Design a protein around this nucleic acid. Structure first.
Ligand SMILES: [Cl-]
Ligand SMILES: [Cl-]
Ligand SMILES: [Mn+2]
Ligand SMILES: [Mn+2]
Ligand SMILES: [Mn+2]
Ligand SMILES: [Mn+2]
Ligand SMILES: [Mn+2]
Ligand SMILES: [Mn+2]
Ligand SMILES: [Mn+2]
Ligand SMILES: [Mn+2]
Lengths: 104, 92, 96, 78, 93, 105, 84, 99
DNA sequence: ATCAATATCCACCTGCAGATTCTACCAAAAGTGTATTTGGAAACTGCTCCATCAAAAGGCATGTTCAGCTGAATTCAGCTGAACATGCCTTTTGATGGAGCAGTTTCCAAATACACTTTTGGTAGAATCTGCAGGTGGATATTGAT
DNA sequence: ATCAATATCCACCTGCAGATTCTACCAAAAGTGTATTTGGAAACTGCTCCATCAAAAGGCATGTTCAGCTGAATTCAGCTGAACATGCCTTTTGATGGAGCAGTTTCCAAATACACTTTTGGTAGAATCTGCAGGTGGATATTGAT
């Protein structure tokens, strides 16, 4: 009977509502706003874990580590733009050598 | 005591990849991520309601915030999911 | 046996672009941070994760700066980065 | 103290940035750049420390400092 | 229809520092944007500060920290001076 | 009836700033000193810019500050330039600056 | 009103030359003019898109200066002088 | 003579001229048409306050002038005096405007 | 070109240590039912200010010619920076005690919100004041051909 | 080492569009009284963080050698600047019709408030089990000698 399940979500509608009330964002908060916001957060999280799960089996580990999240963010054009000024700790960089640096 | 999103990030991970787990550090990275996007959308929602002299943040402000912040396809799917969740929530 | 100049350099680029470990030794970096902090507030303590956060940010910043420096060197028809390359990159970034 | 950041370590950072050949003046230039970086971030983090009436610079202080500076970092409580 | 702005206060400060000097209305519009911009940056940074410290009130202490965080060097020292001076003078009835 | 500005020794309006802090959803409560402090800093930075732009207007033999003078004042001052480093002044133009390498040999 | 087509070509070569002069440029290769038109068009799309989003959210049919100002601010291109 | 200035003298004359002044450098009507064409593809039947068009032109001209400054530094860095498309792309790339 | 010799990835083990995951308990937060208020949508309308046109005039875009001098290509050698061996000192790792200090209570005295009431500073508009734009001179550099 | 050509600077001049002052109403500050919250001030915990310790590996400092990158020098085809004729189309100034902001009123779907019940999520140990540190031995690549 929780709001999450009533909206068909894993992310906590109730907690998102409290964080919106207490974050000094506006006098009042509609009922659908935490639902809509919870759904966007769950979708972006599903999108990243989708690709980073892939990066992890493409490497023969059960377990997503920060390097996998970095590879998933940076090889996807739209997630890379969204996280353009963000540093993933222990993510390293994408392998990339300028053509002119290569031999022969 | 000390809230984070770990439990819900784990639930979404099993949905998309039942076989796969996640390390402590990588969980901390997803927590940063959720908190970042939350504050981006909520702050943008906040300014939208203020620019329009409204005291309520409704799902319509959240949607315009999402349109302004996410780049293109991310925006279309995010707007679909939110619209769906509000519908399903309202219905039952 | 003796590898020719640049062959080991390319090998190091592939080694280090493949990995994610911090590339500055811990104790010099921690000593440098405490010194800098001393010029703003005295008898300061640090959480260890505070220092790790600073080292993670400092290395990601310098690696990113070396990418833009490298592009500025390539642009001038060189393969060697020089101070003027760093200086151009920092000018275009608005850090100067 | 800043020469604690050694030439081999600066080379390793440049390597990860894809650099192949490094001029000799680079290492001192890199130390000065790193010093401005650390000054700007640590000044701000310590301002968050002093405002909370604390003697201990926390991970969160650094996280907030880095966000202020346009250098958002994931993995340390924010 | 009644639109507030900072114009009369900018004009007073102009007369203080340059009694002989005036200002085109386009320049006044740039000054109005300036005041409102710095207002939001300080207030916003002070809003974060109070929130990180689980405090429900924005006090002169939050304003001062925000000022230190936002203004470069000498500009901060002097703003803090004026700000501290106005507050102590205000509380002394 | 004493205005809070006159109590604080200020030209900028403490009462308006207070209302602006309340209506802006910055925090649930606003201390009595916050609008005083903020209105003083806003007044100070305004005086700082008007001083330098007045001077530019006099170097240009003009009695009236125009946006151009605001730009010269900001971009010629290292600290104002940093503070307004991501700001555009409509009708401000740029600073006269020709890279040496381009001057005739 | 007549239908608007190809108006990026109204950004003329001499107007681009003038802009480059104010930016200090002494000499301009022939291909710079169409690069500039491409860059300017990307710039205006990003800002106008955001500006129109603010308009539509306010339920207006008129793009206001404020819409453009809030859009400029979001893009990190804050503009002084049009705050009305 | 007939008199004829040498290549570069008038260009430097124009740098000095346009760095003294603050007037918009793109013609107004053509720019307003550009704005309406782009807006028309996003939402049809839009109207514009006239200061909304001027705000866009002021912002667009400050952006391009600024971009041309950085472009010039990239050209001079390559030992050239002539800006080329590769310079704009380097500047835009280091600014983080393009991947 | 290819063959021979040297050196480095990197795919593939195993046996743990350690880091995840798995369980159970329980305060703090989410949910609920019930009552009550209110922001803001809907309708209605005044009246900006936007779209559009008209016309005349000349500021400026265009297209062309012509060649100055810039960028692009090429050669080359001085010398800078890569590779590598070697000897050493700074960092890493460990532990162990103690103390500096977060972080937490329970707290009233001070401080802040809020409804009414009254006072007045601030704004819109019409009335007045006046820089300086935009002309018209020559005075002074500044450039480029001899 | 001098002069024609040309642009740039510098004064003075004025009336008119744009700024400054005037004015009278009124929205929103200030005053008062009172109900509610807060956050600094007291005495505590129990940690993380600092401080020596101290031995030891491996990462760095150093000196040698020379490959090959950088930049200096040189050459020249042809791109781009300067100048000019030509005439299109921007600019300026009003006109006017009406779209659609923006201002008021009404009143309800939706928000807050509150007392109480249920369930969730944090936590911290017990019970897994993943992947790191090493080995190795073949894959692949580089470098010298032809
Ligand atoms: Cl809602
Ligand atoms: Cl206060
Ligand atoms: Mn179209
Ligand atoms: Mn109401
Ligand atoms: Mn050349
Ligand atoms: Mn040689
Ligand atoms: Mn009065
Ligand atoms: Mn004049
Ligand atoms: Mn549970
Ligand atoms: Mn290993």
């Amino acid at each position: 009977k929780t709001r999450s399940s009533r909206a068909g979500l894993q992310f906590p509608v109730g907690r998102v509502h409290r964080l919106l009330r207490k974050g000094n964002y506006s006098e009042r908060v509609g009922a659908g706003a935490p639902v809509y916001l919870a759904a966007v957060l769950e979708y972006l999280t599903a999108e990243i874990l989708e690709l980073a799960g892939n990066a992890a089996r493409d490497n023969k580990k059960t377990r997503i580590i920060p390097r996998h999240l970095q590879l998933a963010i940076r090889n996807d054009e739209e997630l890379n733009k969204l996280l353009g000024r963000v540093t993933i700790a222990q993510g390293g960089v994408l392998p990339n050598i300028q053509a002119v640096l290569l031999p022969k | 005591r000390k809230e984070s999103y770990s439990i819900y990030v784990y639930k979404v991970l099993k949905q998309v990849h039942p076989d796969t787990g996640i390390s402590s550090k990588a969980m901390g990275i997803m927590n940063s991520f959720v908190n970042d996007i939350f504050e981006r959308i909520a702050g943008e929602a906040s300014r939208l309601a203020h620019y329009n002299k409204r005291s309520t943040i409704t799902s319509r402000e959240i949607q315009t915030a999402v349109r302004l912040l996410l780049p293109g396809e991310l925006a279309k799917h995010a707007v679909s999911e939110g619209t769906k969740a509000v519908t399903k929530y309202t219905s039952a | 046996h003796r590898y020719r100049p640049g062959t080991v350099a390319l090998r190091e680029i592939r080694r280090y672009q493949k990995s994610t470990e911090l590339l500055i030794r811990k104790l010099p970096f921690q000593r440098l941070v405490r010194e800098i902090a001393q010029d703003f507030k005295t008898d300061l303590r640090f959480q260890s994760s505070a220092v790790m956060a600073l080292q993670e940010a400092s290395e990601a910043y310098l690696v990113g700066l070396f990418e833009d420096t490298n592009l500025c060197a390539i642009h001038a028809k060189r393969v060697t980065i020089m101070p003027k390359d760093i200086q151009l990159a920092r000018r275009i970034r608005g850090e100067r | 103290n800043i020469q604690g950041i050694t030439k081999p370590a600066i080379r390793r950072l440049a390597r990860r940035g894809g650099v192949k050949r490094i001029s000799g003046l680079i290492y001192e230039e890199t130390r000065g750049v790193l010093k401005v970086f650390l000054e700007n971030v640590i000044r701000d983090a310590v301002t968050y420390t002093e405002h909370a009436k604390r003697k201990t610079v926390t991970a969160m202080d650094v996280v907030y400092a880095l966000k202020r500076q346009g250098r958002t970092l994931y993995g340390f409580g924010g």
